[PDB]
Every structure is written in structure tokens, then in C-alpha cells.
Design a binder for this molecule. Sequence first.
Ligand code: Z6P
Length: 259
Amino acid sequence: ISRYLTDFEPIQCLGRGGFGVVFEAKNKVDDCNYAIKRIRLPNRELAREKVMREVKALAKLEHPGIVRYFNAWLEAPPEKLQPSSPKVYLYIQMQLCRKENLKDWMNGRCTIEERERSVCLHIFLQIAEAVEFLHSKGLMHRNLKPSNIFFTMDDVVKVGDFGLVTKLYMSPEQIHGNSYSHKVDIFSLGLILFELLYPFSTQMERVRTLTDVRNLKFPPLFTQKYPCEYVMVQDMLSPSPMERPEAINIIENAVFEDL
Ligand SMILES: Cc1cc(NC(=O)[C@H](O)c2cc(F)cc(F)c2)ccc1-c1cnc(N)c(C(=O)NC2CC2)c1
């Protein structure tokens, strides 16, 4: 007797993000399509109050870098053997963004003349201003990767799924030594800003050149081409979080004086 099937008309599955299913589905009443994320909560009554704390905090979020929230409800569906094992589902209804994301955008633009310094920065600033907002509400994203950077049907850049918890964008302290600061986010931004400015022909050559930059090894053409941005991306990829800039400081940099 589940609220989803009765009140939403499925369209397609979009992925299984964080081992949780995400559906494009039309609300029968308002006749609008929505991205509907569904996870099973942990069974621990302790580690549920954890997840239920996050959703209450995320529902307060209002910013132009943050995918518009609509609703979040719970469903318990009541043969096999004699393990009952109770399974409660958390549904989160969000604004449906484009099926294609910043990696899709990047994949279809593998030449210098297709990566205008102007446009790349404009995409980065929208990400940074979202990460800043999150940090200011005492949250971190810890999930920044082109794969998970979306566009609204209106081409507003959005930071993708986060909260309710590839590693090429992850920070050293995030992968291992798992008591990290919010500055893990600044590491990810660092690689992303670089990647936007630096088009990649082939996936192997990307993974190589990102792994280089990740260890402060920068293609000599990139440094010469974009000198200010080089300076920034070094700081963002600083091995000590403390020496990495706060999103507010990145945003207020000269580089972003244009419209
Ligand atoms: C499902 C989904 C969740 C969020 N969640 C938050 O941002 C955050 O968890 C939050 C929760 C809250 F309750 C409130 C918030 F303000 C934020 C953001 C975006 C999408 C999404 C939207 N449209 C899409 N087309 C897709 C898509 O194509 N996904 C496939 C897997 C790759 C995903």
C-alpha cells in the first residue's frame, strides 16, 4: 500500500548512486517529472537517527548551487523461509536535472577551442558558490566529481547527490585517515577546475594527467596557458588541508571578474 506507486508514474531508472536507486518519475497530480532517490535505512535504531538527522538538515537548504528539494517520505512493505529481517525505505523527491552531467559535457568537448576560459570559470564559480554555502551551514559535500555535477533543464550548474552516506577527485585524508575537515571539498574543486580548463582526448591519458596534477605535477602547456589558475589549483591541491583556501577566498579571487 506504498505512497510512491499510487502517487507517481515511473518513466525510467537513471542509476544506482551510492548503491541507492534513482528514478525519473511523474507525480500524477502536478504532472511534473522528478528525480526520486530511494535507499534502505540501516536497521540499527541508533544509525537511523543519524540518517534522519541529515534529511532534516538538507531539507532547510535553499541555494542556486543546490538541486531544489520537494519531499521525503518513508515506506514499510510487509513464503521465503523464516528470516523476517525488517526493511524500511527512505524516498527523497528532487528537481529532475538533465540526464547528462559535467563529465558528459566534458566528454563532448575534447579540444582547446571547445573549452573557452570564460565558460569553464562560469561553471566552476557556480560549483564553488554551492560548496561555500554548504560549508557556511556546517556541512561538507565529499562527493564532488563531474559524474555528480548536474545541469537544470535551464542550464544552471548544480552540485549533485550528497549526505545520507571513483576516488580520483578524493583527497588523501578522505581515502584513508577518515577524520577529515570540510577542506576535502577544496581538493576536489582543485582537480575539477584543472580538468575544465584542460581537455582530454582519451580516458587513459586523463587518469594519467589527473594523477600527475593530484601530486602537483602540471603539464607545462597548462601552466603557461593559464598561470593564475595554476597558482589556485596548486593551493587547492595542497597536501595539508590548512594551507588550502576556504571556498569564500577562491570565489573572491580576481580571476572571477567577468560577465
Ligand atoms: C536523486 C538526486 C538527489 C540529490 N540530492 C541532493 O542534492 C541532496 O541529497 C539533498 C537532499 C535533500 F533532501 C535536500 C537538499 F537540498 C539536497 C540531488 C540530485 C539528484 C538528481 C536529480 N536529477 C537527476 N537527473 C539525477 C540523476 O540523473 N541521477 C543519476 C544517478 C546519476 C539525480
